[PDB]
Structures are given as structure tokens and as C-alpha cells.
Amino acid sequence: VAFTEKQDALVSSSFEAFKANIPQYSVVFYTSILEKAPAAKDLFSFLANGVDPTNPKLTGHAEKLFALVRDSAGQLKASGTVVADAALGSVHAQKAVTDPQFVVVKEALLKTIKAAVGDKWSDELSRAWEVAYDELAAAIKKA
Numbered sequence: 001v002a003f004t005e006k007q008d009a010l011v012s013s014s015f016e017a018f019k020a021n022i023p024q025y026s027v028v029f030y031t032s033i034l035e036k037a038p039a040a041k042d043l044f045s046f047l048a049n050g051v052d053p054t055n056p057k058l059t060g061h062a063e064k065l066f067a068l069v070r071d072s073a074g075q076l077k078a079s080g081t082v083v084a085d086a087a088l089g090s091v092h093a094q095k096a097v098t099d100p101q102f103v104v105v106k107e108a109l110l111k112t113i114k115a116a117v118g119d120k121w122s123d124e125l126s127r128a129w130e131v132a133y134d135e136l137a138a139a140i141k142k143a
């Protein structure tokens, strides 16, 4: 896979934007997932009763999902490939994890980065994350 230095530089800087206010931006992330995938609270316990900003898991889970996706960009840049941990592959083997759902999560994350970067947003930025995620998602899908 073709992932450039500049693409990584973008992924990194937008991620730091995220990390500036994870509390704020994680709300966006889950609000989005539930609007598009309402079954998603049967799966995610901490979302059982809607988006609970008091639940500490909400920001833990989000920081960890965003970071992994960054890691990927970093990997594509380093190795031209992405590798997924065994455990991450094992939990996503459940039937709730469908192609249609990969989209939802994806659109939710780009939606969250946007709000995080503001006017610094562009197709270019959207594309590097896009790659980062899609390359990881496949790395999960069978690994």
C-alpha cells in the first residue's frame, strides 16, 4: 500500500487535535454510531442507555480506537502493511461485525476528525484516515 509521509503527517496532526478534547469529540463518535447503528448499544454496554458522558469507558474506548487507526497509518508508512493483534481479530469474529458496520464506524470517525480539525478539513485528510482505517479493517477481518 501507498501511504506517504505527508499523509501520516496529516493523520498525526488531526489525532493530536482529537487528543486535545477527547471528552468533547468522543460524544460525536458514539452519537454518530447510534444514529446510524441503533443496535450498537446492545453490543456496547456503556451505550446501553444512550451516550453517557459520565461513563469513563466512553473516552477510554474512543481514545483506544482512534489511536489504533493512527498506529495503522504509521504502519503503512513504515511497512507498507498493517498488522492486527490476535485478540482484536478474535473479538471481531462475531456476527455483529459486518461490512455495512465497518462503514458506519468509518463515517463516524471521519465525522469526529472533521469537527476536531475544523477548516483544516479536506478530501486529502479524509483520504489518509480512509486508507489507514480500511487497511486496518481488512487486517482485522482475517487475522
Ligand code: HEM
Binding pocket: 043, 044, 061, 064, 065, 068, 069, 091, 092, 096, 097, 098, 101, 102, 103, 105, 133, 136, 137, 140
Ligand atoms: C477498523 C475498525 C475497528 C477498530 C479499529 C476497532 C477497534 C476495537 C477495539 C480497540 C476494541 C476493544 C476495546 C476494549 O474493550 O478495550 C474493539 C472491540 C469491539 N468492537 Fe471494534 N473495531 C473496529 C470495527 C468494529 C466494527 C465494524 C464493529 C461492529 C459493530 C465492532 C464491534 C466491536 C465489538 C462488539 C467489540 C467488543 C466489545 C467489548 O469490548 O466487549 N468493531 N474494537
Ligand SMILES: O=C(O)c1cccnc1
Binding pocket: 044, 061, 062, 065, 105
Ligand atoms: O467502543 C468500542 O470499543 C468500539 C466502537 C466501535 C468499533 N469498535 C470498537
